[PDB]
Design an enzyme around this catalytic site. Structure first.
Site, mmCIF file in Angstrom:
data_model
loop_
_atom_site.group_PDB
_atom_site.id
_atom_site.type_symbol
_atom_site.label_atom_id
_atom_site.label_comp_id
_atom_site.label_asym_id
_atom_site.label_seq_id
_atom_site.Cartn_x
_atom_site.Cartn_y
_atom_site.Cartn_z
ATOM 1 N N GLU A 35 0.742 -1.332 -0.112
ATOM 2 C CA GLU A 35 0.067 -0.043 0.007
ATOM 3 C C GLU A 35 0.815 1.212 -0.015
ATOM 4 O OE1 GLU A 35 -3.154 0.443 -0.554
ATOM 5 O OE2 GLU A 35 -4.173 -1.621 -0.071
ATOM 6 N N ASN A 46 -7.381 8.991 -5.669
ATOM 7 C CA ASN A 46 -8.326 8.015 -6.529
ATOM 8 C C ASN A 46 -9.130 8.737 -7.873
ATOM 9 O OD1 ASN A 46 -8.775 6.664 -3.375
ATOM 10 N ND2 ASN A 46 -7.519 5.848 -5.015
ATOM 11 N N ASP A 48 -12.173 8.754 -8.453
ATOM 12 C CA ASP A 48 -13.361 9.556 -7.747
ATOM 13 C C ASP A 48 -13.032 10.736 -6.823
ATOM 14 O OD1 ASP A 48 -12.343 8.497 -5.485
ATOM 15 O OD2 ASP A 48 -14.154 7.678 -4.652
ATOM 16 N N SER A 50 -11.288 11.077 -4.111
ATOM 17 C CA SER A 50 -10.760 10.583 -2.714
ATOM 18 C C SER A 50 -9.234 10.214 -2.908
ATOM 19 C CB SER A 50 -11.455 9.240 -2.419
ATOM 20 O OG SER A 50 -11.008 8.408 -3.303
ATOM 21 N N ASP A 52 -6.104 8.358 -0.759
ATOM 22 C CA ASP A 52 -5.480 7.343 0.372
ATOM 23 C C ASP A 52 -4.541 7.912 1.080
ATOM 24 O OD1 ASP A 52 -7.325 5.476 -0.868
ATOM 25 O OD2 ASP A 52 -5.899 4.636 -2.132
ATOM 26 N N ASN A 59 -8.438 5.662 2.985
ATOM 27 C CA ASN A 59 -9.322 6.290 2.053
ATOM 28 C C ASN A 59 -10.197 7.409 2.566
ATOM 29 O OD1 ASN A 59 -11.867 6.267 0.254
ATOM 30 N ND2 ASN A 59 -10.278 6.627 -1.142
#
Ligand code: CL
Ligand code: NA
Length: 129
Positions: A35, A46, A48, A50, A52, A59
């Site tokens: 990750e 992301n 969308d 969003s 991380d 998220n």
């Protein structure tokens, strides 16, 4: 902070991750690896809108507040910036809510794609725990 493998395993052990909801320590270290590369400062945007955050790439859609994810939740009741600290307490406290949420560690795409049903105990060999 970039954690060493065993350094991260001990911190995670201390904070109660070892066999949390049936997931051995190997599973959490394997996920941190893929990750964030054990980097508490890692961010990734992301499609969308969003973001991380942190070593477990939690998220902004659901889990933390970054003030720029319209229509999102803050279910861990934290600023996303807390997840970027060298202390992993908030990342780990927030991961316990996430892994409790019904999909287990399937919630983490890299765990599901790179860790799941592999020899995850490799990630903690040579560690004094
Ligand atoms: Cl599970
Ligand atoms: Na949010």
């Amino acid at each position: 902070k970039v954690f060493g493998r065993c350094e991260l395993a001990a911190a995670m052990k201390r904070h109660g991750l070892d066999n949390y909801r049936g997931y051995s320590l190997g599973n959490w270290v394997c996920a941190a690896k893929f990750e964030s590369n054990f980097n508490t400062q890692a961010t990734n945007r992301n499609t969308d809108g969003s973001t991380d955050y942190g070593i477990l790439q939690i998220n902004s859609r659901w889990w933390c507040n970054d003030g720029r994810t319209p229509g999102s939740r803050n279910l861990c009741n934290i600023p996303c910036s807390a997840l970027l600290s060298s202390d992993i307490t908030a990342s780990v406290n927030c991961a316990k809510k996430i892994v409790s949420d019904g999909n287990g560690m399937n919630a983490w795409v890299a765990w599901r794609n790179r860790c799941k049903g592999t020899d995850v105990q490799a990630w903690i060999r040579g560690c004094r725990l």
